[PDB]
């Protein structure tokens, strides 16, 4: 069974770390930080890693039931799986699938529906992923809402992400930190069964990030979000499950209107993309261009300068 990448453009694809569409292809030196995202991690032969799941709208979503911390507008959601079944904290994963793999404050809407009469309610709610109360692995996550008496316990509740917040308009663009993994088990306890951190090994090569701009809700947040693979690529790899014949598959960025190949990159078996370039650069590509698989090449096939 031959390997292939989907015939989809950047504007047609979706980021795999937040329910937002892709915007650009970025490249930069990932040396001053550890690139270890948990969402959007998939191998070229179909194996999912970290907390990566298939539904792109499930990213950064939480489901369960809330209990009111008396004396504040805060709530504690006891997390359940997407199917509303009992979350199993013993499953060999860092966190429930679709858990924010970055440190920051995410604003969205907590919605609740009463089982009996069918009454509904919704409130603006913010979740701090880098807080001491953030423990999705243990199945309990704290939110901060508008009200403090409107939500009902033992009733199904869902968080829908919208954007990210910058706290007090102070330092400007220090949060969220997309390359800082939150402690999924809370304080002290470290993460478990994480996806392996990626890093370019060949000289002159850097990572090719799929970059989107998260929506902003308050302050001056760093709304950048770089994912190693689009969610559509994860879905196509889970569907195909094509066996990898080498460590590196050579991808060519072809313009369909002309057939002229603009640049080439390396799609590693573990699930990331490297390009032969040095520096911070936004790729100027045709909007209708897409990636094309050619062949499995040398593990250190020297690319052409981008």
């Amino acid at each position, epitope marked *: 069974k031959p390997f292939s990448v989907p015939v989809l453009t950047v504007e047609e694809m979706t980021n795999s770390r937040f329910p937002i569409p892709l915007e650009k292809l970025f490249t930069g030196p990932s040396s001053a930080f550890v690139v270890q995202p948990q969402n959007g991690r998939c191998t070229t032969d179909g194996v999912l890693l970290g907390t990566t799941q298939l539904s792109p709208v499930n990213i950064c979503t939480f489901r369960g039931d809330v209990t009111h911390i008396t004396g504040s507008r805060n709530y504690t959601m006891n997390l359940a799986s997407q199917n509303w079944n009992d979350y199993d904290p013993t499953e060999e994963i860092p966190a429930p699938l679709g858990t924010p793999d970055f440190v920051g404050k995410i604003q969205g809407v907590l919605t609740q529906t009463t089982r009996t009469d069918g009454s509904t309610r919704g409130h603006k709610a913010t979740v701090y992923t880098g807080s001491a109360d953030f423990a999705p692995k243990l199945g309990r996550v704290q939110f901060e809402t508008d009200t403090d008496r409107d939500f009902e316990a033992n009733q199904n509740t869902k968080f829908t992400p919208v954007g990210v917040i910058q706290d007090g308009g102070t330092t400007h663009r220090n949060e969220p930190q997309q390359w800082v993994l939150p402690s999924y088990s809370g304080r002290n306890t470290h993460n478990v069964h994480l996806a392996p951190a990626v890093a370019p090994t060949f000289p002159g090569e850097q990572l090719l990030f799929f970059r989107s701009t998260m929506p902003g809700c308050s302050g001056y947040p760093n709304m950048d979000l770089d994912c190693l693979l689009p969610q559509e690529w994860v879905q196509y790899f889970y569907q195909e499950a094509a066996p990898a014949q080498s460590d590196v598959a050579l991808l060519r960025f072809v313009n369909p*209107d*002309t*057939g*002229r190949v603009l640049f080439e990159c390396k799609l590693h078996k573990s699930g990331y993309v490297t390009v032969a370039h040095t520096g911070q650069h936004d790729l100027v*590509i*045709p*909007p*209708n261009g897409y990636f094309r698989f050619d062949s499995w090449v040398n593990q250190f096939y020297t690319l052409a300068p981008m």
Partner: T-cell receptor
Amino acid sequence: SVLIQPASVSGSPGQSITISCTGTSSDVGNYNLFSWYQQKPGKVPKLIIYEGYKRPSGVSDRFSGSKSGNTASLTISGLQAEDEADYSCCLYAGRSLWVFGGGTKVTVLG
Amino acid sequence: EVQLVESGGGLVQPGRSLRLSCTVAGFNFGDYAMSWVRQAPGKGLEWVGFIRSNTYGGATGYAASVKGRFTISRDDSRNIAYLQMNSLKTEDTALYYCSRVGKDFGDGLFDSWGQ
């Protein structure tokens, strides 16, 4: 998009002339490919500039190009008699659409 | 040698139809994209339309002036690029070139032109 060119540009032998190619609000992004074609009377158009500034093989170093978002420019240094022709700019923005300019008649003065 | 030979044009009453063929020699026709560009009497060049290589997904793209009226196609077995002009207008009176798109040194390019 409509690409506005001047109707004619004149110049003496040896001078350096410049032809503008102005776009409109149709600014999709940064992928604005401006090509320049020379056309002599009774001849087919000949690509002289592509990708804003690059040159095909066999084109003299007398022709240069620049791209500024939606404003392309074709410079002909050291004007010669055989440069008297119609120069047309074509914009391709990467969405399966090519647009040609009105063309400019370069005539050698004197 | 890359060469484009157009044929099929002449006289047609407004509202009728007319098909132009472009034969090619010297390359792989199914490899390159082909664009029809017309020039009106005493006016500038006007991009009519284009068709891609069949490998990349066929596809057609026309200009706003002839969209819904002119249909571009191709036959790789016979080495032909067809432009079918339907519901003709007196403004379509022009000299029609068929050109190759090219893929070996640029994008827009238009490296070769027919007579």
